[PDB]
Amino acid sequence: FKIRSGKSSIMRSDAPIGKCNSECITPNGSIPNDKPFQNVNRITYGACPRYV
């Protein structure tokens, strides 16, 4: 197999896959990156609001 550097991750979630475009992905779904902070879920991937 091929072992690379770190740019990808893995997430546990049962939410469906949809046809849209959002930079941030959380286990519950996808959230806009417009707002600086977020309260949905701690686990995040990509450009996301800071969790509070």
């Epitope: 475009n21 930079e23 990156n33 417009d34």
Partner: antibody, heavy 127, light 110 residues
Framework: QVQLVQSAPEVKRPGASVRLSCKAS????????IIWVRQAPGQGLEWMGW????????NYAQKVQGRVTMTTDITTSTAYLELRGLRSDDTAVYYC????????????????????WGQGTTVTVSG | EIVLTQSPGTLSLSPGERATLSCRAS???????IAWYQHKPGQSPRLLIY???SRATGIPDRFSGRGSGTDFTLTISRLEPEDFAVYYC??????????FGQGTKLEIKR
């Protein structure tokens, strides 16, 4: 629709002064300011100045500060750009476009961009 | 001033191929600024991407803005003949100054 109409092309001489127009339709004039950008032959776009109907305050580019005066008349939604002491490099196509939001705080960047442009006035200055 | 450098200056792609343009800012910019324009020759410039990644009203879904910080990108999926133009980088700052970019030309066809 939101539409911007500009003045007819002008052919001035070096050292003269040219007055350019930008009439606005489809949106209330006081809410947004109008900014002017020019394209010299074989050159990229260059911002020059911004004026607001809500606030007469004007910010001009460093290249043209002493020679540029921008005025606005609410009736009838007409913006004027005056350039004095024209020199050969000033020969360009001058566009106008709606800019900032005035009268309300904003969050969406549409009110921080230039969407509805004019056809553009082509100004040629030569002796 | 803040200087935005576009890349590549000339890009030649075949019709139906994705195209990626890159604009690097001299200093960090909040995604609230940095917008992308299109200038077909002989016509008024058009606004494609406002904000950082938001399509303007009445713009084809293929155009996709993205990026953050110094680097911002515009990606065109399934290039069509309407798309041949010069594309311009833009920023904004508190005292209104709209510093443009040099421009990238799409010399499509082969």
């Amino acid at each position: 629709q939101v539409q911007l109409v500009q003045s007819a092309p002008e052919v001035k001489r070096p050292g003269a002064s040219v007055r350019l127009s930008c009439k606005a339709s489809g949106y209330t004039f006081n809410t947004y300011g109008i900014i002017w950008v020019r394209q010299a032959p074989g050159q990229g776009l260059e911002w020059m100045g911004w004026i607001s109907a809500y606030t007469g305050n004007t910010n001009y580019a460093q290249k043209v500060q002493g020679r540029v005066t921008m005025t606005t008349d609410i009736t009838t939604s007409t913006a004027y750009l005056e350039l004095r002491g024209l020199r050969s490099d000033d020969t360009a196509v001058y566009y106008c476009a709606r800019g900032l939001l005035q009268g309300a705080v904003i969050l969406d960047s549409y009110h921080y961009a230039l969407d509805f442009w004019g056809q553009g006035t082509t100004v040629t200055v030569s002796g | 001033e803040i200087v935005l450098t576009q890349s590549p200056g000339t890009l030649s792609l075949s019709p139906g191929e994705r195209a990626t343009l890159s604009c690097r800012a001299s200093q960090s910019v909040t995604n609230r600024f940095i917008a992308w324009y299109q200038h077909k020759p002989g016509q008024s410039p058009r606004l494609l991407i406002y904000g950082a990644s938001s399509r303007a009203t009445g713009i084809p879904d293929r155009f996709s803005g993205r990026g953050s910080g110094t680097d911002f990108t515009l990606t065109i999926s399934r290039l069509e003949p309407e798309d041949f133009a010069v594309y311009y980088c833009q920023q904004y700052d508190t005292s209104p100054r709209w510093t443009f970019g040099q421009g990238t030309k799409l010399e499509i066809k082969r």
